[PDB]
Each structure stands twice: as structure tokens, then as C-alpha cells.
Amino acid sequence: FKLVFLGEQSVGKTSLITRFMYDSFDNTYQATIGIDFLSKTMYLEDRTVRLQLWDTAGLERFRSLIPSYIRDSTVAVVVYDITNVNSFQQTTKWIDDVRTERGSDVIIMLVGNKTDLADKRQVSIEEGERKAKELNVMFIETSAKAGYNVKQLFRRVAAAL
Amino acid sequence: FKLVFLGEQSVGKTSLITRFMYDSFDNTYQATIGIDFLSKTMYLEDRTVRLQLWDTAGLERFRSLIPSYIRDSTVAVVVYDITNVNSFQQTTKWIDDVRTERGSDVIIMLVGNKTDLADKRQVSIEEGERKAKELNVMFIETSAKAGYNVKQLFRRVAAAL
Amino acid sequence: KSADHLNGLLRETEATNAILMEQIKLLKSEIRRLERNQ
Amino acid sequence: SADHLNGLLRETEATNAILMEQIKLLKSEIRRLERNQ
Ligand SMILES: Nc1nc2c(ncn2[C@@H]2O[C@H](COP(=O)(O)OP(=O)(O)OP(=O)(O)O)[C@@H](O)[C@H]2O)c(=O)[nH]1
Ligand SMILES: Nc1nc2c(ncn2[C@@H]2O[C@H](COP(=O)(O)OP(=O)(O)OP(=O)(O)O)[C@@H](O)[C@H]2O)c(=O)[nH]1
Ligand SMILES: [Mg+2]
Ligand SMILES: [Mg+2]
């Protein structure tokens, strides 16, 4: 059972995976190179599930590999930064790329990360909820720093398999 | 059926594999980084065989991986340069490293490369033949540039499986 | 009858095996690239 | 013959392991070069 994390640079893809796998957080930013791999059989929701996690690079040099993995993964998590308008606009790109490899044969989740920065917010919740229904995919806002809705995220994905 | 090429820097490991896989040769030197992988289907003596080839780095930074692969490979080719005395002395190192991972449960071949440079020779054939019997391993001199004894090499290794 | 799930799964371990070597090649040339502009 | 499927699968997973190890080493080597830039 495979998942792939897509999105612009420094939105919090690497961070959301850490908050989930190890329940930790690091303020120090490190750009993901290539495609890191993490796996944990999280016995999620009154039953057992094995999850493969592919952490893609928001970095532009290391994107050639991505399409090949989208084709291999049964689920896609598209992440944006609510304090960054561009990273939100670009979520259209990443969903297009996914529709191209799997069409409707895929589960997709839009994620508005960094809710703990509500002060510096540029994207509203309505714009996010609207866009999600627009492209017919699930939606949820999270904070990897605060641990908010990070478990909720994976729990909802396992409930749609 | 797996093989691993060990030896000092620029002895001709990468070159011996090329002369065999593609029957070509390149004068331009490129240091092997990490562990390149090549595989090709050789039909020998009434049945078609399969060879995995691990090209290790003579480079010192990229050696941490080596031990893990020696453990995985059923055959080891230790290569030295006959116009370089040091690279010949160091073949003792590489055989020790192999005995450590597999003891006598491994086929080992010592190789004296660059015979086309007989003018600039520093190591004699006797020193090589002597050392081989000394450490109880096979021996053969070759030239990757000239194509000399390169097929002979792999043919003798397949005959000891 | 279970000698069946052994194939579909083996081919997945070989599929993931393929993409690994692809990423490895890309990384290696990236290293060679950085070393040149040194 | 459902036997040779295991010994071989574990080999494809053994080779799979060492690949990811080499990948990690390469990535940090990249990060290292970028620092001394
Ligand atoms: N305040 C706040 N900061 C966050 C949050 N999530 C991530 N960050 C920070 O934002 C930066 C995001 O870095 P990454 O987690 O690597 O994000 P990324 O999308 O994987 O970036 P790449 O790996 O280059 O593609 C890091 O410095 C984090 O510390 C969050 O929920 N709240
Ligand atoms: N004259 C002559 N030159 C050779 C021969 N074999 C290799 N060379 C040259 O010697 C150098 C050896 O380079 P490599 O083949 O990469 O040797 P290596 O052991 O793999 O070095 P690393 O990959 O860094 O570990 C190259 O420049 C070759 O062109 C040979 O048989 N005769
Ligand atoms: Mg990332
Ligand atoms: Mg080499």
C-alpha cells in the first residue's frame, strides 16, 4: 500500500512524514534530495495496514524521477503552505501530473500545512475547500510543527482504500 | 551468479568490464563513483549463464559500501597495475577483506592488468604467480586496451562454479 | 495455490528495484557535476 | 517450485537493501559538496 508526497519546496512534506513516523519535528530546513523512502506498519483504525512512503523533492533538479513513482503509488498527498500563495496555486500542477498517470484510479489528498502560522496566512480555508471539491479530491489543513491533524490525515487516507 | 571487482584506483577495473560487456575501450579516465552495476547473459558450455557485475570504487571516499557487497557476491576479482608497484602490494588488503566476509566460501582471481605496457613494467610475472599460490587464489595477466586475455578471464571464472 | 502471490509481489520488488538504480544514476552524475564546478 | 520463489525473492530484497544504502551515502556526498561551494 503506497503513498507519494508531492508539492513545492519547503511546504513541509518531509516534516509531515517525520511528525507521523517518529513524532518529532525539526526547525532546521533540509531540502529533500531525490526520493527518500520510509515505511512503518502503522496498525491504523481497528485493523492493520502496511504503508510505503515516497518523499519527493520540491527541488527542481530532482523531478525527473517523480512521474515514474506516481505511476507506482496508489495514493497521492499534495501539500501546500498556507502562508505562501504560490505554493497553493501550484497544487493544480501536481494534481494534473497525477491525473495523467492514473486518472481516477487514485486517491488524492490536498493539504494546507503550517496552520500554527495563522497570523501570516495568505490562503483562506474556503479557497482550499473550494479547490478540493473543484478537482474532486479530499482536503485537510495541518500543522507538522504542532502535531495538529497529522494523525487525522493518514487515518482518513486509510479509510478510503 | 554475482561478481565483484576490487582494487586500487585507475588499475583498470571499469575498463576490464567494458572490454567484456561492450568490447570497447576508452583512454579517458573516469573514477568510478559508488558502485556501478552491469549485467549480461553469457551462454557457455551447453547452458546459458547469468552474471551480475559490481564495479567498486578504487576511490577512498566510496569504500564504506564495499564490505556489504563482498558479502553478497560469490566471486571476487582483485585487479592490479603491473606498471605500478603499490597497486600490486595492496592486493593483499583486498583479499584479506574478502577472507573476512566469506573465508574459503568464495572464488578469487588475481589480475595483472595493462600488459600492453610491458616496457614500463615494475612487477614481474613470477612475483604475481608466486603471490597467487601464496594466498591460494587464481592468477592471470590481461590487457583491457588490447583485449588480451579479457575473455579468457571470465571463461576461467565460470569454469570454477 | 499461494505460489501465485509470489510472482505479482516479486515483480513489485523488481519494479522498485529498477527505479532505485535510476535514482542512483541521477545522483552519481549530480556528484560528477558538482565536482567539475569546484 | 513455490520454494525457489522465496530464496530468490529474499535475494531481490537483499540487493534492494544495499541499493538504498548506497543511495543514502551518495545523497550526503552531494550535500557535502554543496557546502564546500
Ligand atoms: N511553523 C511551521 N513550520 C513548519 C511546519 N512544517 C514545516 N515547517 C518548516 O518549514 C520548512 C519545511 O521544510 P521541509 O519539511 O523539508 O518541506 P519540504 O516540502 O519537504 O521541502 P523539500 O524537502 O525541499 O521539498 C522546515 O524548515 C520546517 O521546519 C509547520 O507546520 N509550521
Ligand atoms: N595502456 C593501458 N591502459 C589501460 C588499460 N586498462 C585501463 N587503462 C587506462 O587506465 C585508466 C584506468 O581507469 P579505470 O578503468 O576507470 O580503472 P579503475 O580501477 O576502475 O579506477 P577507478 O574506477 O577510479 O577505481 C584509464 O585511463 C584507462 O584508459 C590497459 O590495459 N592498458
Ligand atoms: Mg520533501
Ligand atoms: Mg572501477
Distance between CA atoms of B107 and B66, rounded to whole angstroms?
17
The total number of residues written for chain C in this structure: 38
CA dist A118 to A81, A83, A142, D37, Å? Answer: 11, 8, 11, 37
Q: For residue B6, report the phi and psi dihedrals to the nearest 5 degrees.
A: -120, 155
Residues A56, A5 contacting (CB under 8 angstroms)? yes
DSSP collapsed to 3 states, B111-124 = EEECHHHCCCCCCC
Work out the angle between the directed axes of helices C5-36 and D4-35 (0-180°, nearest 10): 20
| DSSP tag of D26 | H
- Partners of residue C17 in chain D, C-beta under 8 Å: 12, 15-16, 19
Handedness of CA B92, B98, B99, B104 (dihedral sign): negative
Residues A81, A10 contacting (CB under 8 angstroms)? yes
Distance between CA atoms of C30 and B115, rounded to whole angstroms?
34
Q: For residue B116, report the phi and psi dihedrals to the nearest 5 degrees.
A: -65, -15
CA-wise closest residue to A114 among A157, A64, A79: A79
List of residues 6+ apart from A72 with CB closer than 8 A = A2, C15, C16, C19
Instruction: Name the β-bridge partners of A139.
Output: A110
Long-range contacts formed by A127-136: CB under 8 A, 24+ apart? A127/A88, A128/A82, A128/A88, A131/A91, A131/A92, A135/A92, A135/A95, A135/A108, A135/A110
CA-wise closest residue to B108 among B140, B130, B83, B69: B140
Residues A76, A108 contacting (CB under 8 angstroms)? yes
Range of the domain at A130: 1-161
Domain count, chain D: 1
Instruction: Name the β-bridge partners of A52.
Output: A2, A39
Interface residue D19 vs chain A (CB under 8 A): no
Residues A54, A37 contacting (CB under 8 angstroms)? yes
Q: In which region does residue B147 sit, left (phi positive, over 0), alpha (psi from -120 to 50) or beta (all else)?
A: left
- DSSP H helices in chain A: 13-21, 66-70, 85-89, 91-102, 125-134, 150-158
B19: Cβ below 6 Å to ligand 2? no
Identify which of D14, D15, D26 has the shortest CB distance to residue B34: D26
What the block records as the C-alpha cell of A47 is 485493523
Residues B54, B3 contacting (CB under 8 angstroms)? yes
| CA-only gyration radius of chain B, Å | 15
Range of the domain at D33: 1-37
Pairing of strands B2-7, A35-40: unpaired
List of residues 6+ apart from B59 with CB closer than 8 A = B9, B31, B32, B33
A15: Cβ below 6 Å to ligand 1? yes
B58 labelled binding-site residue: yes
Domain count, chain A: 1
3-state secondary structure of A16: helix
Cα B72 to the center of its chain, rounded Å: 16
What the block records as the C-alpha cell of B44 is 557457455
Interface residue D25 vs chain A (CB under 8 A): no
Terminal Cα distance for chain C, rounded: 58
What the block records as the C-alpha cell of D13 is 530484497
- Specify the residue for cell string 552519481: C28
| Resolution of the experimental model, in Å, one decimal | 3.0
- Specify the residue for cell string 592488468: B113
| DSSP tag of B34 | S
CATH number at A147 reads: 3.40.50.300
Cα B38 to the center of its chain, rounded Å: 14
- How determined? X-ray
